[PDB]
C-alpha cells in the first residue's frame, strides 16, 4: 500500500501437472483518452451492404481471447504431441502497479509529469448487460511475446438500424445506447489494485486427434457382408448381388460425411488463376435483412491439394505485415494460412458437392437419369469434425440467447460459452482543467491530458484429456523446421522483432474413427 | 488513506425491489474560488418592480434536487407506467476523491 | 350438496407476484347431445388431396387452449411490458352446479 | 339448508341503549334480467351540455344510502329531541331466502314456475375497484315503509368522453371498461344465504343543535369594549370613539360569517313571479371540461323569509306524485321543501352578497366609496355551519380520491368517507335455452327468462352524543300535527298508499355558539 510499495509481483510461466495445467502470464499495458471523455454517434452512409449505426465509448477493455497470449511455442508444441483434449476450468484475473502521468504541451516540446491523486475506474461485466463485442476475433489483445507492450482497444458496439430516405443508417426505435458509468465501478489510484475470479462451466474436450480410419473405409476387409442389392436389370428379370469380394462402394453403411456447400477453388500458384480484380462477387454469401455478407468462414471444408478459398479458412499475418494488403505470386511470406485436410475423413472436401440422387421416374422406355447435390446440410446419422483451434486462433465466443441454435461450436473454432468470461472495461476518470470564476451552466469541455500504463495479468487453469493409444508405429509430431536459418524459429531478430513462423494446428495424434 | 488510494468507489444504478426503490447516482465536480476570497454586497438601482439588496458568498453548493438526476429515462418508464404513486423516503450523500490544484 | 345448495363460487381473476402469477377464470357452457347417442363412421369420396376415413362421436370436451381464454387485455399488456419471459407451471380445473334439462 | 328449510328471520326493530343505538331492518326485492344478458355501450349525440359515454350492465345492486330506510318515524322523533349528535359505527348485511323463477310465454299467458337448480350470484366490492354510483342520490333504495316490495336498479356507469367532427360522445383512449365476472362472486342456490360485516372509519358527529346566538351578537351587552377606533374625519383633525355604548355594529370580533353567493330567488307566491317559461339561464353555474353544470345545492345558505331558490335547497316528493313534474300556483302539496333558515347564525343569506369593501384611495378632494361583494370564498377566522341531514336524504358519500379536497362534507349533506360502505351486485346467473344439434361457434343468443326474489336485510350501528343543556326555559321540538285530518300523519290512507308528510330537520334543540 502508499505511493512507494508495488501492489504486486510479475508472474509469467506454465505448471504442468499430470491432469489440470496451469498457466499464468503477465503484459504491461498503456491506456489513452478515447474520444475526449465523450460518447459518440456513428453511423454510415447512402444504402449498401456496408451500413452502419452505433456509437463510440470513451472506455478500453483487457482482451486476452486468444490462445498464444497464454502459451508458449513450446507449452503448445508440449501439448498437441502429448494429449487428446483440452477444456478450460478457471480463470483468475487481476491488475496492479496502476500509475496515472499528464502531458503538458509547451510549444513543440511534450512535458510528462507523474499525477499522484488521479484514478482510473475498472469493472468486470459478470451479467452481460453490454453488448459483447469478444470472440469476434479484432485486434488488440496481449501480444504473442511477453516482452511487449501494447496499448488498450477502444470500446465501441452498433445497434439495429433503419430505412429512410435514402439512408438505412437511420436509427430504429429500439436502438438501444448504453450508458457506462450507470455501472457500479472500483476506482484505482495508483495504490490499491484490482482482482477477480471466474470459471468455466463444463464444456466437452476439444479434439486433438485426427481420425485413423475413414468412414467409407470402416469394415472388416476379408469377410463380405451378408446384405443383398439389385445390380443389374438386363434380361427382362432381376438380379441380385451380394455385398462383398473387395468392392467397397457397394457396402451398406451406418454413417455418412458431414454436411457442407461448394466453394470456389483458386490454386495456389498465381499464373492458373482467372484475373479477377477482386473477389466478391465469387464469394460464397448469406444475406440478412435484405444486405448481403460473405460466408467465413464455411462448415470445416477442406479443398483440393494444392487450392484454397478466400476466408473459407482463417489465415494470419506476421508482424513483418503491416498495411492493409500484401501481395506476392504465391501465398506472401507473411501470411500463415491453415488447413483443415485433417477432416477429409469425416467431413466433406469443397471442390465437389455432397453427392448425387435420382433425377426421373424410369419405365422400360425411358432411361435412368440423376442429379448432382452441391450443398448438403444436417441429416440423422450424420457425422463430422469441428474446425481445429489454433496457437494464434480465438479461444471462445459468446453464444448469442435465442429461441434456438444447432450444434453451437463457433465457426473460427473454439468453446462456445453460455456465460463467457466477463468483459473488463477501464477508463481514466477525467479531470477538468481550472473553471472560470463566473458561473456556467454549460457542459465543461477543457480537460487535463492524461493516460496511464501498469501491469495486468491472467491466469488460465486447463483440463486436459491424456493420450492412451496402443498402435505399434510412431506417429506424426510437431517438430521445430529441421534446417538451418538466419533467424531462429519463434524467435527475435536483429532489429528486436519477434515473429512468428507458423500457425500451429493441434491434430497430430492419431485415433481410431 | 494517503495520497495514493482512492477515498470511494463510483456507484451508479437503479435497485428495483417490491416495495422500497432505490437509486444511486454519482458526478464529477469542479469548483473555483468565489469572489477572491471575498463576501459582497449586492443591490439594485432606482424604484422599480425588480429590487434588490444582497450577498454574495465565496461558497459553493451541491444541488441534486431535480428529478431526471436521479432516474434514467428508462426507469422513469419503468417507474411511471406500473405505479400509481412514489415518495421519497431516505437520502445518503458523500464526497471523496477530493483533488486540489494550483494555477 | 342437495338440490338447493350450490357446488362453488365464481372465481375468476389474476393475482401478480413476484415470481409466480396466478390466473383464474370462469365460464358457463352448454353441451348438447351429438349424434343422437351414436358413434358414426364418416368418410370422403373420390382419389383426391383431402381424403379421411374416421370416427364421430357423441362426446363434447372442454378446450381452454387458447391464451385470451386466460388473460385480460389488461394483464396482456401487463404481462409483455414488464418481463422477458413465461412458462406455465400447474393448472387447476373444476365443473360444478351441474343442471339437466329435457326439451 | 336445502329446499324446504328457511335460511333467516324477519328482523326489523330499533334498540335504544345509553350510547350505542342499534336499528335492524329488512325488505322485500325482485331482481329481473337486465340488458338480456350483455353489457352494452350508451352515448349522447351532438355537442351539448349534456353529452356522455359510458356502459350498461346487466347487474343489480342494494342501495340502502338513505336514512328513513333505517329509522321510523317515530323513532327519528325519539332521535331528534333528545340528542346533539349521531354518527354510524357498523353496519351488518345479509341475504336470504333466495327463490329464482322462470317465466314461459304460450300465447299471451304467462306461466310462471319455480326454478330450484337455478343461481344468483352476487359479491361485494371492498376495494372500491369499481366505479362508486352510491352517495348520488339516485332512486331504487329500499322504500320507506317496511311492508312494501322493491325492485332493485340496474347498475351503469359513465366514463370520459371526448371530441371529434360534431360529436363530443367519443370514447377518448382512457376510457375504462370494467367487466364485473372479473371479480370472485358467491354463487347462491336457494339454500344457501350470504351475509358480510363492515366497519366506519370515526367521523365527526353530526351537530343536531341549532345555535344560542349569532356571531355578530355574541359579547357581553353591559359593558363596552377598551378599543378605539376612528369615527369622524371632520374638522381637519381625528377623532377616535370608543367601542360601546350599545352601538353593536361598531363592535371588534374575532369570527366572521361563513362562505356563500348570491342566489336567485323566486316568491313562493307564484303571481309575484317573474314568468320564465323556464329556470336555466337565471340559475347559478359552474362549468367543467367547457360545458355548464348548475350549481346544486350550493352552500348552506338561507333565502328571505317567504322565497326559494331552484335547485340550491334539497326537494322531495310523496308517494301520490309521479311522472316527472308538478305544479300548483304555490308550491305543490306533494313537494317537501327543507329549509336552512336554522344556519342565519353563523351562515350567510342568499338575498345579498356578503358584505362591502373600499373601492377608491381617498383625498381631501375626493370622496371615500365602497363596493359591494356578492361571493365570499374561505378566509382565515370563518365559521359555518354544515348542511342538515333529513329522514329522506342521503346518509354518505365516497370522497373522491384526490390530491387535495377541503372540508370534505358532502353538499347535500351526510358523512363523507374515504372507505365508505361496499356496493354490492347482484346477477341472475344464465341460462341458456336448448342448443342446436350441429355446432356453432357463435354466441349463444337465446336464453330461459327467468327472475328472482328473497329477503334482505340492514343492521346499522350509530353512535349518539348526550344532550346535557342547562337553560332553564323549555326548547322547540318536533310535534306531530295538532290537527285532526283525514288520513293520520305518516301512514297509510284507504287505498293502501304510504304517504310522508314532512321531511324532518334534525335541529332543533339550541345550543350556544
Ligand atoms: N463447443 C460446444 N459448446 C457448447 N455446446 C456444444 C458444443 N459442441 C456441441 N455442443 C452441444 C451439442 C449438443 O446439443 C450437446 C452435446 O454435444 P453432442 O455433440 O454430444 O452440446
Ligand atoms: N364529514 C366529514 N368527513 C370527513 N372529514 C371531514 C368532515 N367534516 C370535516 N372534515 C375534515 C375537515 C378537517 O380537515 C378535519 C377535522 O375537522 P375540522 O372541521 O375540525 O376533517
Not at 220 to 240: E, I, K, M, R
Request: net charge neutral; charged share 15%; proline share 7%.
Amino acid at each position: 500500500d502508499g505511493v512507494g510499495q508495488s501492489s504486486g509481483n510479475w508472474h509469467c510461466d506454465s505448471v504442468w501437472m499430470g491432469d489440470r495445467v496451469l498457466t499464468k502470464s503477465t503484459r504491461t499495458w498503456s491506456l489513452p483518452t478515447y474520444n475526449n471523455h465523450l460518447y459518440k454517434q456513428i453511423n454510415g452512409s447512402g444504402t449498401g451492404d456496408a451500413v452502419y449505426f452505433g456509437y463510440s465509448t470513451p472506455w478500453g477493455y483487457f482482451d486476452f481471447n486468444r490462445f498464444h497470449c497464454h502459451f508458449s511455442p513450446r507449452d503448445w508444441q508440449r501439448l498437441v504431441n502429448n494429449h487428446w483434449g483440452i477444456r478450460p476450468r478457471r480463470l483468475n484475473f487481476k491488475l496492479f502497479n496502476i500509475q496515472v502521468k499528464e502531458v503538458t504541451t509547451t510549444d513543440g516540446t511534450k512535458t510528462i509529469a507523474n499525477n499522484l491523486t488521479s484514478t482510473v475506474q475498472v469493472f468486470a461485466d459478470t451479467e452481460h448487460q453490454l453488448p459483447y463485442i469478444l470472440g469476434s476475433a479484432h485486434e488488440g489483445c496481449m501480444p504473442p511475446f511477453p516482452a511487449d507492450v501494447f496499448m488498450l482497444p477502444q470500446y465501441g458496439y452498433l445497434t439495429l438500424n433503419g430505412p429512410g430516405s435514402n439512408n438505412n443508417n437511420l436509427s430504429t426505435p429500439s436502438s438501444a445506447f448504453y450508458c457506462l458509468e450507470y455501472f457500479p465501478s472500483q476506482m484505482l489510484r495508483t495504490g490499491n489494485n484490482f482482482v477477480f475470479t471466474y470459471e468455466f462451466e463444463k464444456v466437452p474436450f476439444h479434439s486433438m486427434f485426427m481420425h485413423n480410419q475413414a468412414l467409407d473405409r470402416l469394415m472388416n476387409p476379408l469377410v463380405d457382408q451378408y446384405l443383398w442389392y439389385l445390380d443389374a436389370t438386363s434380361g427382362n428379370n432381376l438380379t441380385f448381388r451380394k455385398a462383398g469380394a473387395k468392392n467397397f462402394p457397394e457396402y451398406f453403411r451406418n454413417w455418412i460425411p458431414g454436411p457442407g456447400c461448394r466453394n470456389q477453388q483458386w490454386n495456389k500458384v498465381g499464373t492458373k488463376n482467372n484475373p479477377q480484380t477482386g473477389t466478391w462477387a465469387s464469394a460464397n454469401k448469406w444475406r440478412l435483412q435484405g444486405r448481403l455478407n460473405k460466408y467465413a468462414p464455411g462448415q470445416p471444408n477442406a479443398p483440393a491439394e494444392g487450392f484454397l478459398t478466400n476466408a473459407g479458412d482463417l489465415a494470419f499475418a506476421n508482424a513483418k505485415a503491416t498495411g492493409a494488403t500484401t501481395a506476392a505470386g504465391t501465398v506472401p511470406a507473411d501470411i500463415l494460412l491453415t488447413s483443415e485436410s485433417e477432416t477429409t475423413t469425416t467431413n466433406m472436401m469443397s471442390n465437389n458437392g455432397w453427392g448425387a440422387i435420382a433425377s426421373n421416374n424410369q419405365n422400360a422406355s425411358v432411361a435412368p437419369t440423376v442429379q448432382y447435390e452441391d450443398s448438403a446440410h444436417v441429416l440423422p446419422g450424420m457425422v463430422w469434425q469441428d474446425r481445429d483451434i489454433y496457437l494464434q486462433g480465438p479461444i471462445w465466443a459468446k453464444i448469442p440467447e435465442t429461441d434456438g441454435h444447432f450444434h453451437p461450436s463457433p465457426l473460427m473454432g473454439g468453446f462456445g460459452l453460455k456465460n463467457p468470461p466477463p468483459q473488463i472495461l477501464i477508463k481514466n476518470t477525467p479531470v477538468p482543467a481550472d473553471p472560470p470564476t463566473q458561473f456556467s451552466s454549460q457542459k465543461i469541455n477543457s480537460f487535463i491530458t492524461q493516460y496511464s500504463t501498469g501491469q495486468m495479468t491472467v491466469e488460465i487453469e486447463w483440463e486436459l484429456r491424456k493420450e492412451n493409444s496402443k498402435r505399434w508405429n510412431p506417429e506424426i509430431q510437431y517438430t521445430a523446421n529441421f534446417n538451418n536459418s538466419a533467424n531462429a524459429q519463434f524467435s527475435v531478430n536483429n532489429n528486436g522483432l519477434y515473429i512468428e513462423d507458423r500457425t500451429i494446428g493441434t491434430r497430430y495424434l492419431t485415433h481410431t474413427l
